[model samples]
Target: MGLSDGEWHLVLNIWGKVETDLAGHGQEVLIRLFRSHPETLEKFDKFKHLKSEDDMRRSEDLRKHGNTVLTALGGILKKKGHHEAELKPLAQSHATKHKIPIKYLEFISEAIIQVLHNKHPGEFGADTQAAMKKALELFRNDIATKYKELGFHG
Candidate 1:
């Protein structure tokens, strides 16, 4: 059966049990697609580490820094690039590349949550729902701040 948003939440609630490669989508698949498109490839290459094991590590660091910077950051997350609607396309692209089940892509949010837990604690009260919200907030702030620093604005 195709996964629903709720089932994905169940997967994320036990994120640690999931392997990194299966966490969101396959890294190589995502990278190759970006590589096929020269312009996006260039941009993706700049963040090459995002396709690495270190991507999780780096995401952990950035989230920590985000919590340090944006106090209201949690509230403003969805509007931010990282946690915005833009993510679905990226996720979908990777999902298509790997033929990952829709269920797996749904759990991408969960993988993101684990990264958030590493950065900002206490946002979640040991409940998966709380953790999910906290994680998305962190993602929004962290991504927006990063792009802003890169001078990429509307």
Candidate 2:
């Protein structure tokens, strides 16, 4: 389902809070993703050898990449109609060039919602959840379209 007007406002408002500490929140999202799927580390050369959870936690590369991802997300959030222009190329690169499976994107989106849910237990209610769910679905669907065009089966 698409997000309602009020729900979009709520989502953006929460995102405003997130922007204030992108590094911290972005790190939390990455940590959550790694915890949920340790195999995800294989996607990052810098993280491939850092098998231990503690090692992954301490990696400066992780922090840098996390911030980069959130910065991109922030841009997407700020630009409503322009998301396709920004996301399409990125999605194509990640899927076709990097060979990162669509599953990783799905996992990362879930990780973002999970982290926000954990952080804002009281405020992250059903409407907020639906809003994020819709946004991620739209983003991932756009990527999947590019993936299919690139001859990916799934």
Candidate 3:
């Protein structure tokens, strides 16, 4: 699992470490987000009913399928960088393809943390509370950018 594992691992957010590695801090980052935005974790609870081994497996599948989906999304959004224009159409045509409900989208980043925490304690830390706190904070930038692109910034 050298190269393949490394490549598959790329889809994961490296959860925690020191800040000066040019990569940035994940543990502290997620910690702050959870503390500052309690509402975010609430959303994660809302999806608890949906989460299972299957959901986890699907997420793993995304490592492969995501590339294809992203390629198609990129071809549409490439020159214009018009995220909505590109994604909205897909959402309309195939709702699950792009149409993220308001409830679930908020949990996406946290989901990353949850998954990583489940797998890599080295990155996420041993304490559950600390892992969650750090997960939210570490995920903020990606989440913010996603929301910004989706017009949820306002």
Best by lDDT: 2
lDDT of 3 by residue, 1-154 (tens): 1122332233223412221221122332233334445454343342334334344334433234434433443333232222345544444432333444444433444544454565556655445434343333423333344555665541
Q: Candidate 2 clashing pairs?
A: none
For each candidate in turn, give its C-alpha RMSD to the true structure in angstroms.
13.0, 1.9, 12.5
Local error of candidate 1 at residue 95 (angstroms): 5.6
Segments of candidate 2 deviating more than 4 angstroms? none
Model 1 Cα lDDT, one tens digit per residue, 15-127:
43323223232233233333343233333333545554456334644334333323222223323333445444433343343333333322434444544454335433366
Error of 1 at 82 (Å): 15
Which tens-of-lDDT digit does each residue in 49-70 have in candidate 2? 7766687678888777888888
TM-score of candidate 1 to 2 decimals? 0.28
Q: What's the TM-score of each model vs. the native?
A: 0.28, 0.88, 0.30
Clashes of 2: 0
lDDT of each: 0.39, 0.78, 0.37
Better of 1 and 3 by lDDT: 1
RMSD of 3: 12.5
**Residue 24's lDDT in candidate 2:** 72
